[PDB]
Symmetry: D2
Subunit: 125 residues, 4 copies
């Protein structure tokens, strides 16, 4: 029943070679796994998030976000990334994001706790 439930659900790849597998729920849920090609990461990590299940019908994209905390059975990078973005449908469907990666730090080092970047996900490559 979600407008882009079908368009969003599946396997996505970003420009770093990371893989995001996601299921979109009718109501707005996102659940899945993430495997990063870079950084202090091995194998899959749990992800959860939310998307707008009833987007505007004027050619606008579909807002969404999700989170990964970088702990699984293999490693713990004491950090979490959140991606905020929009899904755009069609023959070259994309999810265009910006992300914030916060590490656990001492209060002294907190100023330097957060990295910022941008990932573009596609259904190919």
């Amino acid at each position: 029943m979600g407008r882009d439930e079908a368009g969003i659900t599946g396997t996505w790849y970003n420009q770093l070679g990371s893989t995001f597998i996601v299921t979109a729920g009718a109501d707005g849920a996102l659940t899945g796994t993430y495997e990063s090609a870079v950084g202090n990461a091995e194998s899959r990590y749990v992800l959860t998030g939310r998307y707008d299940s009833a987007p505007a019908t004027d050619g606008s994209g579909t807002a969404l976000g999700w989170t990964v905390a970088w702990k699984n059975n293999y490693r713990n990078a004491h950090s979490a990334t959140t991606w905020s973005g929009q899904y755009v449908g069609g023959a070259e469907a994309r999810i265009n994001t910006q992300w914030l990666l916060t590490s656990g730090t001492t209060e002294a080092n907190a100023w330097a706790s957060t990295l910022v970047g941008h990932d573009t996900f596609t259904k190919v490559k």
Copy 2:
């Protein structure tokens, strides 16, 4: 079994007067509701996220994040915010975040799709 499962779970308030109610799961889950005191928002919205359930024991904070998509039974703001941050425990416990708020836009307006800010959550006020 999560290290800050107890410290995180509950009701938090930010500097805008918004209210975040969250349950932390032993494994890393965050689930809850968010009510914003500002913007195109009314009542509670679903939130989901992840936290590091086994943080460093050296006085570092606990990395976490979560997402709200701004649709509920009342309104649809065609947008989603993700908060990335760290929980710091103790008598003045805090969750210090930065956030990204993406709106669904046309490809023409996509450059201007994302707001960035910072929220500090406390257990009082």
Copy 3:
């Protein structure tokens, strides 16, 4: 005498079709003009910034930034963008940035004052 003084100075174009003309000084200065292909902007606007005039020699990029306040003789958009990034030299030289665009706002609307994005500049197109 600046290491990338020569590589940086000139005309650059981003993915939106904007044009950045810059002179790099030996000491670290950047001065120039910016013309945005989008938004509340017409013609050229003054820019100033700074770059690292003695970068690492290990294949690392060259950190830099600059600012435009969106006032000139034609328009005043009551806003300023800052680009932070790195210059990478070679046959496909690039300046890879992230940017923050702050508008003047009332204290009530300050939460929503700042847009964030990413621009990639090239010497062609």
Copy 4:
């Protein structure tokens, strides 16, 4: 002749204990020095930037930004910070910023090149 030329020019202090000394020009220029209380920094560093010299008269703040590249005669941190923000005048005048700190990196590590934060400057402390 700049509206907040007088309000902006002077010495400012942020929550980390850093010191920003700035002169505002009638036309929009900002020039000065910055001394960071944290990070890979010693003594003063050159800063340059721009502000809106004719802000809205409706109680809105005054948009501005500036850049520091972290090289001076003492150290070179192969990095640059840009602050984007707004000046708010009155008895408790403030400059409320967000900042992007980019390091020069290899193309492999570029994903992790940029830190993001927020500084609040005041005329006291």
